[PDB]
A paper describes a structure:
Cathepsin K (CatK) is one of the most investigated cysteine cathepsins, both by academia and pharmaceutical companies. It is expressed in high levels in osteoclasts, where it serves as the principal protease involved in bone remodelling. Cathepsin K (CatK) is a target for the treatment of osteoporosis, arthritis, and bone metastasis. Peptidomimetics with a cyanohydrazide warhead represent a new class of highly potent CatK inhibitors; however, their binding mechanism is unknown.
The cyanohydrazide warhead positioned centrally in the inhibitor molecule forms a covalent isothiosemicarbazide adduct with a thiol group of the catalytic Cys25. The nitrogen atom of the imidate moiety of Gü2602 is strongly stabilised by three hydrogen bonds to the backbone amide of the catalytic Cys25, carbonyl group of Gly23, and the side chain amide of Gln19. In contrast to Gü1303, there is no hydrogen bonding between Gü2602 and the Gly66 residue. However, a new hydrogen bond is formed between the backbone oxygen of Asn161 and the amide NH of Gü2602. The P2 Boc-capping group resides in the S2 subsite of mCatK and makes nonpolar interactions with Tyr67, Leu160, and Ala163. The B-factor values were generally in the low range, but increased values were only found for the P1 N-benzyl-N-methylacetamide part of Gü2602, with the highest value for its benzyl group. An analogous B-factor pattern was also observed for inhibitors in iCatK complexes. This finding indicated an increased flexibility and dynamic disorder of the major crystallographic conformation of the benzyl group of Gü2602, which is located in the non-primed part of the active site and oriented out of the S1 subsite. In contrast, Gü2602 primarily occupies the S2 subsite, and the N-benzyl-N-methylacetamide part (especially its benzyl moiety) is highly flexible and has two alternative types of conformations that reside in the non-primed part (the S1 subsite) or primed part (the S2’ subsite) of the active site. We hypothesise that the conformational flexibility of the complexed ligand at the boundary of the non-primed and primed subsites provides an entropic advantage contributing to the extraordinary potency of Gü2602 in the low picomolar range.
Residue numbers in the entry: 1 to 215
C-alpha cells in the first residue's frame, strides 16, 4: 500500500458539510463513502443526500445517531440513493420521501474493517477509497482542534460517539496520520478536517467501526 494517499487530490471528496443540531454524522459519513466510490467509478463527484438516509434508514435513529453499515444496507435494499439536489438537507428528521427518479448512486452492500486493525483500514483506504469511520469525539482537545496530528490518551476507543470519513492517510513531520473529513462545517478544526494519530494503538477507536460501500 502507498505510504500517503489523499483522495481530495483525486477529486473523490465533496465540500465539508454542516449536520447542524441533528445527530446525523453517520449519514454524512455514509454519503462521504458513497461519494468516493461514485467518483472512482464514473468520474462524477456529486453531493448525495444524507437527508434521504436520516429519513429512510428505519434501522438507524435519524437525528439520534445510526450505523453506516445500516446506511449502506438501506441504499442496497432500496436500489439507490438521491442526490443532495433531489433530496436536500433540512438539518432535522422528516418522513421518508425517497424520489426514485432522482437516484444518483447504488450499493451492492458493504465490508467492515476488522475491529482495531489500523493496517487493514489503511489498505482499505489505499484500495477502495474514502472509508466511513467512527471515533470518540467527546474530548475538548478534539472539539477545539486547530492543527497537528491529534492525539489525546484520554480518548476512549470503546466509547464511539461520532461518525466521520478517512479520505486518506500520510505522515507530516514523521507523525503518521488519518486525513479525517468532519461534518461540522469548514469553521471547525482545519477547514472542516482533522489529522488523527495513525498507528498509535487505535487512537480514539479510529478502526473500531470502519466500513465502505460495495459499488
Ligand atoms: C453523530 N451525529 N452521532 C449521533 C450523536 O452524536 N448523538 C445524537 C449522540 C449519540 C451517540 C452515540 C450513540 C447514541 C447517541 N454519532 C453516532 O451516530 O455515533 C455512532 C458511534 C456512529 C453511533
Amino acid at each position: 500500500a502507498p505510504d500517503s494517499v489523499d483522495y481530495r487530490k483525486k477529486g473523490y471528496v465533496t465540500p465539508v458539510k454542516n449536520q447542524g443540531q441533528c445527530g446525523s454524522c453517520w449519514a454524512f459519513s455514509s454519503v462521504g463513502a458513497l461519494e468516493g466510490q461514485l467518483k472512482k467509478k464514473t468520474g462524477k463527484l456529486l453531493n448525495l443526500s444524507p437527508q434521504n438516509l436520516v429519513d429512510c434508514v428505519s434501522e438507524n435513529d435519524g437525528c439520534g445517531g445510526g450505523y453506516m453499515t445500516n446506511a449502506f444496507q438501506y441504499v442496497q435494499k432500496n436500489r439507490g440513493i438521491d442526490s443532495e439536489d433531489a433530496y436536500p438537507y433540512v438539518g432535522q428528521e422528516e418522513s421518508c420521501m425517497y424520489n426514485p427518479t432522482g437516484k444518483a448512486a447504488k450499493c451492492r452492500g458493504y465490508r467492515e474493517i476488522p475491529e482495531g486493525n489500523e493496517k487493514a483500514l489503511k489498505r482499505a483506504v489505499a484500495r477502495v477509497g474514502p472509508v466511513s469511520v467512527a471515533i470518540d469525539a467527546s474530548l475538548t482537545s478534539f472539539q477545539f482542534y486547530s492543527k497537528g496530528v491529534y492525539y489525546d490518551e484520554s480518548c476512549n476507543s470503546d466509547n464511539l460517539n461520532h461518525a466521520v470519513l478517512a479520505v486518506g492517510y500520510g505522515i507530516q513531520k514523521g507523525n503518521k496520520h488519518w486525513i479525517i473529513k468532519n461534518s461540522w462545517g469548514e469553521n471547525w478544526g482545519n477547514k472542516g478536517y482533522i489529522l488523527m494519530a495513525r498507528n498509535k494503538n487505535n487512537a480514539c477507536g479510529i478502526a473500531n467501526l470502519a466500513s465502505f460501500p460495495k459499488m
